């Protein structure tokens, strides 16, 4: 019944914190801040452009989010600076177990469903050495919407020929788990932050900035349907497909 | 030309930080964290439920966002605790110059356009003694969307009989400013946080949690059209209108 495993890209297969060395150059001493706000604003702008009916591809969203973030620090970077710096998003490091996971999943059909513009995804996947791990790398761009709009998830059937019930959708992002579940896929959430660790981290004197972002982005969202499955890592997927309901 | 002044409610006419006593009661020592994450998640859930096509009114959104927020701390509140604590959002205090601004705006049409569910807005407006200050208190609920969806702003002409070009929309929220501008209204943004202050606050030693929320929510959003006018407080609106554009 599961004929295909479809993966979210940013934050699920690829580490969005991996732009850290490059952002710590835009503002020495503020790389950590920049990395978090940039990701947060990229997500917010994807949602707000889509809800307004004013789509622009993820490359433009990524650059607009970066401009906002650097603007908070008092900077006014020009477009050429922004485009150069935003290339960091096309070189994100894959999670260490992604390649082993994707190889052990075959012979299932393997794919990505991402907000990324087509060129961004091509570079990201190839730079990570994973182009031969996917049957299809689907961008939402043809639909002019962003996850979790249902039309973004509709592309899976269009491109792959499989129905929602035959797809295992994989994401570490709570909003994306909710959209996929809403659309009708079976969902495996990748939870890298134990709830109990976050609770204690929040209760320990200092509430650092990094903790704030973890609290906003690494949990299941309350409005959302629960994922069918939750694993701590991508490497557990193949075994999950083997014996789990 | 301007015939009606339409205001966003939460964050604009009413202070969302005024839930501080209720939150400090929910978790002594974590009141400020809860306030901020609750507001952020309320906004995210409004956008994500709308974008998914799975609307729930703002009373459900507010409680869902509160459950999430208390859950990050390791709590598991039952529904009655959530409904009870969420009433703090129906008791928000108006900004100190709101009463005076509204009084000076008659006899122009005065209205609210908010995400708030009809019961919520009724009780919030009554509590602040401002019921006779508005010609209409419009909830997005009949359209079953949330701002900045275009159908939310379409309600203004439906209810008031004035066209977009005859409306001055007032918000302190960058996404709502963008939504209203996209829709065709003239927009006056209320900017309570000088940009230069934020830039220095952020470069000043360790970044406090409260600063993170300011950085995410108090500026103009980069994907949005710029507002027509920017004022530091609601009290400046009357004078802005007599000498406006």
Swiss-Prot record, chains A, B:
Transmembrane segments: none
Binding of an (S)-2-haloacid, residues: 9-10, 39, 114-115
Highest taxon listed in the record's lineage: Bacteria
Gene of this entry: dhlB
Record field: pH dependence: Optimum pH is 9.5.
Subunit record text: Homodimer.
EC number(s) recorded for this UniProt protein: 3.8.1.2
Keywords for this protein: Hydrolase
Species the sequence originates in: Xanthobacter autotrophicus
Top EC class for this record: hydrolase
Name under which the protein is recorded: (S)-2-haloacid dehalogenase
């Amino acid at each position: 019944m599961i004929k295909a495993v479809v993966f979210d890209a940013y934050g699920t297969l690829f580490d969005v914190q991996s732009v850290a060395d490059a952002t710590e150059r835009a503002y020495p001493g503020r790389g950590e801040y920049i990395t978090q706000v940039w990701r947060q604003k990229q997500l917010e702008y994807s949602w707000l452009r889509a809800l307004m009916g004013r789509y622009a591809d993820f490359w433009g969203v990524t650059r607009e989010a970066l401009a906002y973030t650097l603007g908070t620090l008092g900077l006014e970077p020009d477009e050429s600076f922004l485009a150069d710096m935003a290339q960091a998003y096309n070189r994100l490091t894959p999670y260490p177990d992604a390649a082993q996971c994707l190889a052990e999943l075959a012979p299932l059909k393997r794919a990505i469903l991402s907000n990324g513009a087509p060129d961004m995804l091509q570079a990201l996947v190839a730079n990570a050495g994973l182009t031969d791990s996917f049957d299809a790398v689907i961008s939402v761009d043809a639909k002019r919407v962003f996850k979790p709009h249902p039309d973004s998830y509709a592309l899976v059937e269009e491109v792959l020929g499989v129905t929602p019930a035959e797809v295992l959708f994989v994401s570490s992002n709570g909003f994306d788990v909710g959209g996929a579940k809403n659309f009708g896929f079976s969902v495996a959430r990748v939870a890298r932050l134990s709830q109990e660790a976050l609770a204690r981290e929040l209760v320990s004197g200092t509430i650092a900035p990094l903790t704030m972002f973890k609290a906003l982005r690494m949990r299941e969202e309350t409005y959302a349907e629960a994922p069918d499955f939750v694993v701590p890592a991508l490497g557990d997927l193949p075994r999950l497909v083997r014996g789990m309901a």
